[PDB]
Amino acid sequence: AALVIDNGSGMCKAGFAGDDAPRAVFPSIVGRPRHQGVMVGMGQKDSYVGDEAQSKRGILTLKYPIEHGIVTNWDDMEKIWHHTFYNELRVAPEEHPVLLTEAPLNPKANREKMTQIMFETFNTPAMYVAIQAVLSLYASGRTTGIVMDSGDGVTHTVPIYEGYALPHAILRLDLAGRDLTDYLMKILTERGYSFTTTAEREIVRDIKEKLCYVALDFEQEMATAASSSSLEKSYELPDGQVITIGNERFRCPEALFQPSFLGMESCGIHETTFNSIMKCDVDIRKDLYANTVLSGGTTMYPGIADRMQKEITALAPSTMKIKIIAPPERKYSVWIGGSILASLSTFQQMWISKQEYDESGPSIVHRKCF
Amino acid sequence: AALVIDNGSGMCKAGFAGDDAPRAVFPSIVGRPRHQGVMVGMGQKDSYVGDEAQSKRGILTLKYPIEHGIVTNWDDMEKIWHHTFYNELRVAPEEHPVLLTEAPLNPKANREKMTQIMFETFNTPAMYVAIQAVLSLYASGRTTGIVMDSGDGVTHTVPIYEGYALPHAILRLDLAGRDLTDYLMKILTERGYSFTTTAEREIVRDIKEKLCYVALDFEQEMATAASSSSLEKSYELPDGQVITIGNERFRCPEALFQPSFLGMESCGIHETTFNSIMKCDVDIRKDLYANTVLSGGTTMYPGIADRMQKEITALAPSTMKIKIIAPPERKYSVWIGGSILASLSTFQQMWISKQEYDESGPSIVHRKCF
Amino acid sequence: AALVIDNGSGMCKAGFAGDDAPRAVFPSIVGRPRHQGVMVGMGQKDSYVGDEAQSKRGILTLKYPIEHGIVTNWDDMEKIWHHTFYNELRVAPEEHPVLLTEAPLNPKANREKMTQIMFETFNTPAMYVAIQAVLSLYASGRTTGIVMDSGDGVTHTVPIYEGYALPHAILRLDLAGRDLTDYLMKILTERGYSFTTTAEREIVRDIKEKLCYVALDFEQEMATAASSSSLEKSYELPDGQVITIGNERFRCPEALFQPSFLGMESCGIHETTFNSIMKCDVDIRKDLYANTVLSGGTTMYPGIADRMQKEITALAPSTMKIKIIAPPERKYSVWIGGSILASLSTFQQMWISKQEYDESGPSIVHRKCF
Amino acid sequence: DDPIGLFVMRPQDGEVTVGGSITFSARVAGKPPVVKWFKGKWVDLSSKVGQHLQLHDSYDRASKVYLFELHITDAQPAFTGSYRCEVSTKDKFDCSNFNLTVHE
């Protein structure tokens, strides 16, 4: 048996290796009481971790440990990890090896420290760190293709041919669901609703996950915005207030397609996919166009696959057809890739060991693996 | 053991900590003989304290030590404290710690002076001052809600979420039962009955406590007041005179709801509760609406809970049903909270020690407690 | 010529384009008589507009048409505008074009309705709506920098680089002088002085404008408050009562710096400025730090520029020196910028014509301008 | 005759004095239909709601008929003109024209 933990901005996915679905999934947040409460017998609890924070959200101030694939504060992460192994998993790290997932083009310090905390803070016989794009590919069960991985933290592109990986071809994009949420809150103010607090900031995120969608054609839906009949959908808040949104709801997802709205010079998600392909050789380009794979937390919005197919086919030559595979439960695909990877016979030999860590040091992470 | 004293305007509630009800309850009044007596062998007794004054009410002039939650004269309070310990309690302050209750948004001088008098005028090993709204919550046993505390002195609102309190959200309202009494005496004159003396001023207050009730709908009862067969009741004075009131009695309670009759801009009691809730965060608002708690001397009148319920539901969204909890013996709830508060083991460590006071000074009250 | 009207919360500034100072400045308040008047020969005047309300303040109840940069009631605004033109200006809207000022991240409905009222309620050949931060920049005579705009309504930040706009970089903060006034009235109660009425509510605002100041260091002045010699000053009310304040005065301005006192998560005014700069590109950051501009009604208090200077320098790199320019008459800078904008020859073509409005409709406001 | 629209009851013409109040309503036969009230071709009454104008919508179970009401109070002389009522349903669009006259 082995443990697989998928850490990305906004959510923690954890479970046992060799199992199709993770045992526990919760948001990755740390919250502290900004307001001093006056009572006798209060448990205090300087900080709350996981869904506990969500319930007691109004009093607490929520801080995300990981921003843009980067961990802002290490101690907060430790509390989260403690929370996952003890509170939901109810298992000891000493007993089971642990697998962690890493975002592409990530700075060196985050990988070395992450292993250092795992070996020293929690005692474990072995651990391994893997790239998020490859695990999603394994979940898919496809040997060759291009993986579009976007989540709450950072959008990443990683084309794969016959297991071989091209370092030059890997592209990192600074667009993310959390970034979208800031855009979304900003867009709500024009309507007449204002959210300036982290606790209700999450509420728009909740809204975004189900209410928001991606238009097949941005220009055509906006044009039809004037006759708001089906475009406006009612939303209910914990407060009891009712929120109605029209053309505003579909443009937020558009921002990934149109970074210009966010003001950033960096190109949209479909162009970035093209850059990875342009970078790649002529021999492998034709299969990659037809093998596009979508994964991550922010890829759950409907219409993404249809719009991406449309945009990629338009920019790309008509000489070859374009197929994009975006299966359901794509958000959890990285964790599954991790669970399958751990279960493979070759992989167990390829573990960073506690014994190996102590002589060589933390720096072996880059040396041993990709 | 420990001693708990609940001081609010008009009444003194005191007793041993850990008991169901206080040992002695009497009105908070100081009275002096305005008329010179011509007798030999008279005690002379420069002042009378408590219910003793009520018996000899006609000769004496009655002065309330506390106005609007503010103590007008400090030595009068000392006389009442002396009276509460030595006369009914039959206990020494040196032997038992003493707990006092304080009103929200109350001036700094009142808390600092109160401790100064307790540490030096009466010797006691320790003492503590607590806010009235929190103690009422303890009697309830509830950990989350919004507390409407209105007493003879001043109406106060203090929303509580899971043991945490928002200082900004706390709203002070200048409405009180004593204020109502002035309105009531003014309203009696139109009928043809006039009271211009403090001694009979209390008599209308006595009338107010049982005869007066809050109408479910002000306009409908007043409309039905044209024909009076149920509205009019006969009240018997100590004098022997018979007093009958009609639509006049239900409207006095109405003024809390309608400050306009009093002539003050500030909104009614139900609007103030909304103000406190609006200040609070969206996430915690849903529990607060259904967790309303009524406490204090002037919340005694029947129909208050029913009128508040319809009014709060009307202004608030229909999405969440509203619950108002107003249990019997709500008047004594603040003292009860004090008795339970003293009882907990954790609380005793928290008491402001006599030893701590001598070096640091009276100013530590704000520093330590809320 | 042309007419320029600056409508921020609490005050109305109006005058003729091409003039250094506005013809009339008065508060933006509409007041109605709450108490019935029993006289013969009274005007009756259902409402009073402007400074007229200030003189007859005790009888009347005062309503602010604009809250947090949002107009709560449109008819009250119409009376104000009527009052600004006919009562002081003594001019006809048909004769002169009219310029109005808008706050950043303001809802769409407020801009569309405002134009609709100016085109139909008043007959004007043309009108234009501009953002408050940019007009202040013109009054300054600078085309590059960062503008900190705070007033009675809402604090807004809008960095400007060589005529370009950065919508993402623009940050709205829910802090205002009016908000400070509520904090201030609350703080007075602890000292034993209580104001619960709108009419005396402005009296503390008057107090705040001259008596309040911003401490160079919050901890050090509060520390020296123990020996209150120079920290106490006497204020005379219209009533004749005398009010003395100590450490209480400097801390109210502190709240802009420390939103925590207010109870809100959002960061203080200096942190917000950093957020706007961080968002902006690295190439233009160096000039922005030394080009800080302060504008608005609540930036009047002494020491604001000095406290901001140390705080921005401390958080910011020491690599570049920090300069803040806050010239005298900064309050009137927005109106002044409007007057200069109207004056330029290029601008007149830019005005939204009455003719353009009639066919297309109110929706052209967002289309034509920022 | 002609197709029969969405209105069971069409809005009616009426006269109002200065300082008085007048109420106009439309009934639609049985998602709930949406009603827009217009002054002239391009003026929307919903954005003109304040002390002078109120909009009221109600549903009655017994007849399966939706009643939409337009409320006018303190009717100033400036309100004299032509008003258009438009109601939209899942499969149909319809409008009606009525005139409001203010005397004095």
Quantity of strands of chain A, as a count: 19
- Chain pair with largest interface: A-B, 24 and 28 residues
- As an assembly, this protein is part of a larger assembly
**Main beta-sheet annotation of chain A:** 6 strands, mixed
Radius of gyration of chain D: 14 Å
Q: How many β strands of chain D by DSSP?
A: 9
Q: Strand share of the residues of chain A?
A: 15-25%
Cα Rg of chain A? 22 Å
Strand order of the biggest β-sheet of chain D: 2-9-8-4-5
The N- and C-terminal alpha carbons of chain A lie at a distance of: 23 Å
Structural class of chain A: alpha+beta
Helix proportion of residues of chain A, in percent? 40-55%
Principal-axes geometry of chain A comes out as flat
SS summary, helix count of chain A: 15
Helix content of chain D: under 10%
PDB class: contractile protein
Keywords: Cardiac thin filament regulator, contractile protein
Entry title: human cardiac myosin binding protein C C1 Ig-domain bound to native cardiac thin filament
Chains A, B, C: Actin, cytoplasmic 2
Features:
part of a larger assembly; 4 chains; A: 370 residues; alpha+beta; six-stranded mixed beta sheet; 15 helices; 40% helix; 20% strand; D: 104 residues; mainly beta; five-stranded mixed beta sheet; four-stranded antiparallel beta sheet; 56% strand; globular
Characterization of this structure:
Chain A has 370 residues and is α+β, with helices and mostly antiparallel strands. In chain A, helix 5 packs across helix 6 (198-211). Chain A is built from 15 helices and 19 strands. Chain A has helices at residues 51-55, 74-89, 108-121, 132-140, 177-191, 198-211, 218-223, 248-257, 269-279, 282-290, 304-315, 333-343, 345-349, 354-360, 364-368; strands at 3-8, 11-16, 24-27, 30-33, 48-49, 60-63, 66-67, 70-71, 98-102, 126-131, 145-149, 155-161, 164-165, 171-173, 233-236, 242-245, 292-295, 324-325, 352-353. Chain A is 40% helix and 20% strand. The two termini of chain A are 23 Å apart. Chain A has a 6-stranded mixed beta sheet with strand order 3-2-1-9-10-19, with helices on both faces. Chain D is mainly beta. Helix content of chain D is 0%, strand content 56%. Chain D has no helices and 9 strands. In chain D, strands 2-9-8-4-5 form a 5-stranded mixed beta sheet, with no helix packed on it. Chain D has a 4-stranded antiparallel beta sheet with strand order 1-3-7-6, with no helix packed on it. Chain D is globular. Chains in contact: A-B, A-C, B-C, C-D. Chain A binds chain B through residues 33, 35-42, 56-59, 197, 199-200, 203, 236-242, and chain B through 131, 134, 161-167, 280-286, 289, 316-317, 319-320, 341, 344, 346-347, 350, 369-370.
